[PDB]
Design a binder for this molecule. Sequence first.
Ligand SMILES: CCCCCCCCCC(=O)OC[C@@H](COP(=O)(O)OCC[N+](C)(C)C)OC(=O)CCCCCCCCC
Ligand SMILES: CCCCCCCCCC(=O)OC[C@@H](COP(=O)(O)OCC[N+](C)(C)C)OC(=O)CCCCCCCCC
Lengths: 731, 731
Amino acid sequence: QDFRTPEFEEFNGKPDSLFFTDGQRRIDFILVYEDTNEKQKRKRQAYESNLICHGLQLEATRSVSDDKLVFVKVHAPWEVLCTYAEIMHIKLPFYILDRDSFFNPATRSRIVYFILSRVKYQVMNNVNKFGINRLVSSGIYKAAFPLHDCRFNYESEDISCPSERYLLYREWAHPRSIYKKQPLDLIRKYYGEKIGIYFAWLGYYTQMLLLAAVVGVACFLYGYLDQDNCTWSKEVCDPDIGGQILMCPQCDRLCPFWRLNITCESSKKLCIFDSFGTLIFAVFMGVWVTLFLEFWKRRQAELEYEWDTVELQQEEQARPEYEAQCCGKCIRVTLCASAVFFWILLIIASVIGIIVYRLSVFIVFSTTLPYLTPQMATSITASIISFIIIMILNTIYEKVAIMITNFELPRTQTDYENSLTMKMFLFQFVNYYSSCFYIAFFKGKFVGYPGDPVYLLGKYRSEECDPGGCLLELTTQLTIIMGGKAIWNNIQEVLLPWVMNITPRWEQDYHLQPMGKLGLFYEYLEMIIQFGFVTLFVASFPLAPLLALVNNILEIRVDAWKLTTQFRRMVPEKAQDIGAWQPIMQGIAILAVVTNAMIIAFTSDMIPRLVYYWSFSIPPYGDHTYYTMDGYINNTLSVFNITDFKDKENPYIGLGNYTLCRYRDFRNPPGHPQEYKHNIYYWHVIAAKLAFIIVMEHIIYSVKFFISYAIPDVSKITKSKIKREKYLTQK
Amino acid sequence: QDFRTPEFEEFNGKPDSLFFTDGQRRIDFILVYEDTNEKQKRKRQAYESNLICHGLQLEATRSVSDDKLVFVKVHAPWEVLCTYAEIMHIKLPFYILDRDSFFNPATRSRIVYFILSRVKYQVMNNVNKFGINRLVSSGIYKAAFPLHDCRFNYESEDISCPSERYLLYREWAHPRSIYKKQPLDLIRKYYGEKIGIYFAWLGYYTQMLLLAAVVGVACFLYGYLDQDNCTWSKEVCDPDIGGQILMCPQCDRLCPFWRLNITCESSKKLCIFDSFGTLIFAVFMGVWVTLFLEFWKRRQAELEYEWDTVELQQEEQARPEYEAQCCGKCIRVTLCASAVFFWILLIIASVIGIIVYRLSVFIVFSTTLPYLTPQMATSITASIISFIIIMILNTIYEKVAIMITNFELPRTQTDYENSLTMKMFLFQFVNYYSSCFYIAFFKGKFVGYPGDPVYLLGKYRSEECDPGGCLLELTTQLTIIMGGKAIWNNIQEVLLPWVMNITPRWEQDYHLQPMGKLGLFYEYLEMIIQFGFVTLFVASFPLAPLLALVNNILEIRVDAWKLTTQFRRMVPEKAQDIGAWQPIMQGIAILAVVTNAMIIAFTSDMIPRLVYYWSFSIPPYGDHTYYTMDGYINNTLSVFNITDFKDKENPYIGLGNYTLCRYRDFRNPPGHPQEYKHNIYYWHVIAAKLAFIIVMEHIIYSVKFFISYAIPDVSKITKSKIKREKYLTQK
Ligand SMILES: CCCCCCCCCC(=O)OC[C@@H](COP(=O)(O)OCC[N+](C)(C)C)OC(=O)CCCCCCCCC
Ligand SMILES: CCCCCCCCCC(=O)OC[C@@H](COP(=O)(O)OCC[N+](C)(C)C)OC(=O)CCCCCCCCC
């Protein structure tokens, strides 16, 4: 009730003062309020009473535009600065040249934020009810933000203070400054080591993506230049050889007998994407991943020394919702785990809907066709509809997961962000990569011969793949999803405000958007999901690091322009690493080695070509003299006489005027004793596929272990600097 | 020259005083010397001068038995105790009840050892030439040991001091106290947290080996009880079926045509060791390994809290050899790496000598035979000769590796122990497990059909395996090596001093053996090598954890009796973990998952039995009705008509009066078009083997990752104790 703030001067002489009316002390925080309201007014006055009794100097100012709002300028004198600096253990370099400039205003802002989080506001209905975040959650204060130095598109009128926001906008956040390196010490000094380590991680990720994109475009150029040497494509759309294959139908009855002449252009793309260049690129990408992780740990330790992020934390004060709300926690985490499991089953049901749509619209496209084949058109529209489902479901799960982790009770903001990180990454992982996993590993891998086809649930045959392989469909789906997400983000964040185009400093900072309690987390998530698209399916097509590099180069500058201009100034924090995203990245790495090996083995369909080249064109099995690839299509596809194993009994007879069809499997001809069991060539191919998985997995994992053992976790320059600062501190 | 020690009292009133002649101050160290000698005498007197000038109180005593030796009792007063306790940051619990008993004499001994390592002994030929270890390396002091409390087999005569060595011998080191648990706080308090963490690791290793041995003897009892249900053994030594197989010869000419009747007893053991019980045990042993590592990290963090081992280290003073001796370091480490690579190539040449011996003595045993077959006798004598070579080579490499790492120059004792650990573990690893790796993975796996056998170097055919499999020979080799090492250590350390069966305290402690600069390191190495025998080849036979448990139970007590009675009292040190042995153990774990999977797949020969049971006894391939195992031997072994592919041209004709032989491979009969290429059954078996490797490796590694994620790295009780001590220290 007593000890009100010093009353309003409201002079508004300079538009950007960043100082009190006496001009000798600097504003650190701004607290905004308005004026059943009498007890809240007593509450605010008691908070300011305990605030002045703690030692912070205060001032009021009524707003010149809207007289309901009152702005409270908060300054910390030097004494409480030294006491709470010794309390929270801030590392310092020494310079007593200016007491005001000894602490940069980021450090002053986090000191005043610690003081505002410690102050009790006298409400003892529940005893010891304290906090500034409780006041803005209760609504008696609207915000407790610090101030920006100046406008971004102008110069600070005060020549005393540095116009650091203008310098950061001119050198880092302008889109016509996209070529310059990020000034990382300015970003750290102005925004804290939680934002600075994010932008350092993003710049380093951009450099490693540049390396991977250079090697990927080299391998893709090798494939595109060596697309003429490929023999099986030239054989499959030779009209004499592939035109007379007469492939067996794919659906039950409503699909006609089709020839293998039609897939030529498809195979003319497919040899660019399943060649030896993609194998060399995936074997490179494993080593690139372990280089990425090891040099990230080196850069993280270098930032840990240089930005002194290991300073001692506080006791991690609980959330105001957890203080205001408080076997039960066990059934709560069980209920939220069952909810996220139910949502994962919903996205699996969406994938099954994509399968059923693929079958039905393939029948429709086949009957409406009389360039692009019906299979490629079916795959393209399926990928489009699928990606639209991905966008709808990830927005809906964003809202639902916010509500789910708000339903259960975490203790602090760290545990809240960790639980939200876990469930959000789990559904974003499954939601983005489940369709690609089904295309790569479970599409056409379980269908039988046309005499006894397999039925998944009855009346729906499992979808058959093209005789070249399902790698082109996986490439189409992956490119559609990744490019659609990149174009969606570059229309939402970049194109929208670009196509859209006196008062004091605190009033200008009020008319902005706060960053939120999560902050950079969502942005982090995008890159992590993008990381999986770089890493899990890199053998699908090698041009994914180039698209990721373009999206990352634009993402750095759109995050910079969002953070400098759009968002309010946040309280600077300390962070030694990115958080849970580094264990998530290591898990994605360890899984994606296996995923790349299984994409080259099962999906890419180059191991049958290698086995036919080395062991099946030889006089024990083939009529050729030496190792050669011609005659691959005629000796690969199995022959089927029309003898249904089975009650309709007419899948192919009603439209068939030819007695013999061919199909993509490795089984015996019908004249054989074991007429439709698996051939010796099938088991040769399967043994070679699993041997390739074992050899590539063990070689890549041993190389990654040896590289992680050979590269030190911290650089020699950083060890020398640590030794030098220890030796100078000891004296 | 000045400030000599206070002169000799030599009263020798009590045999165990552990106090000075005044009786108020406790002896902490004993420095022994004797008396071109004049400069060394001046050196010793200058060392004692700087010692008394630092503040330590000294006393001399001439020896009553041998008058050349002089014993110097070293006491630290309370002032220098507090100053150097604040210097080296010793954690304390508070009790000023006795100033002498505030620091236990282990802490007093390590304080006085720090002081003796800091003191400069005035020799400024090379400037600042300092250390106590330099004096005992130079020979002017013989030793600088602390004192034991009392005799082990008697009670201390002084009722003031606790007879802690007698209590430790009575409760921990006596072989008639083998059933009691180790008193770990007494071991830690008396011997430092370098010995205490070793014995805690050994006791915990014994408990986990007890668990693994219980499950292993359960699986072995399942195999031994279910040895009658096994069908292929009953078929192979049925005289009607296996007696008429007439297997094809193994060597070139001097091996006769042998029948498969002879292997019955061998197969009667082999079904005990390749059954489903060993597969279940290896799948269990992966989870047991990750449980071992996770609960070891939990116990290590619990000891880290309880024994405060994380206290701040000093600057890691260099070795006296490195101070006395000092592109060059690069060529030195290159030369020592080439030396250890040359020695590894020598042990590979010894393995090749074992191969050549196996072939030649199999010919000799086959010609001298007219129970045990010649193959089993050949394997047994080969394992005996091999194990003798292992013992000779590991002793010789122990001496050679000491000389090699003494040739190159490490800076400190930590780097010296790490380099010796690396090269010693590398050769002990290769030396112990190379013969077992060759038996499991490269024995009989590369031999062709008897028409075109393979020659490794010319005139020597690669050795063929028995049709049951090489798992019995691997079991024999593993049991011989492990039991021979255990019996060798229990004859050398245990049986030898057991079959072998006034003066002051410092004279009794002098007539002992010092522990050495390496200490427990060699003992550590044995358990680590034994750990590989528990882990890498556990699917060979499941009774290896039982033998390891017996050897570990005896090893705890022989290390206790060595350390309490035989060895001199060492200076207590601090250690947070075991050292390099924990990364070495994690590497052995990660390798041994793969090694167990490849032992079950390639060596165990149960995947051909499963494939014949499920897919080759069926009317597509077999004459049987349902899944059954009878007819495995007749339908498994390939048939060979005598048609040599090839200049001797008579390997089998000279002793052969039968036109048809059978051999252990999966190839076609001679009437086939592809007469001797690999069968469809071969590629089915190979694909099933590699699928088993992939499935078991990914399942075991995912289970190990999920268990390492599910179990916390530190216990909840230890977190509560850390919270409580932090909350009490904050007040
Ligand atoms: C861990 C993260 C991603 C896991 C993805 C699982 C991949 C599953 C692969 C699969 O379904 O293959 C099953 C069969 C069929 O072999 P394919 O060569 O696909 O036969 C169909 C191709 N063809 C129509 C031209 C004849 O192949 C086999 O019989 C070999 C089975 C080996 C499976 C190993 C999976 C690892 C499980 C932990
Ligand atoms: C990493 C630590 C330990 C590594 C140990 C390496 C193991 C090598 C296994 C091996 O040599 O097998 C080669 C062939 C032969 O298959 P087997 O079934 O052994 O044929 C001989 C058996 N038979 C006489 C009854 C007919 O089998 C194959 O063709 C499949 C080759 C797959 C090799 C995977 C090794 C991983 C290398 C990094």
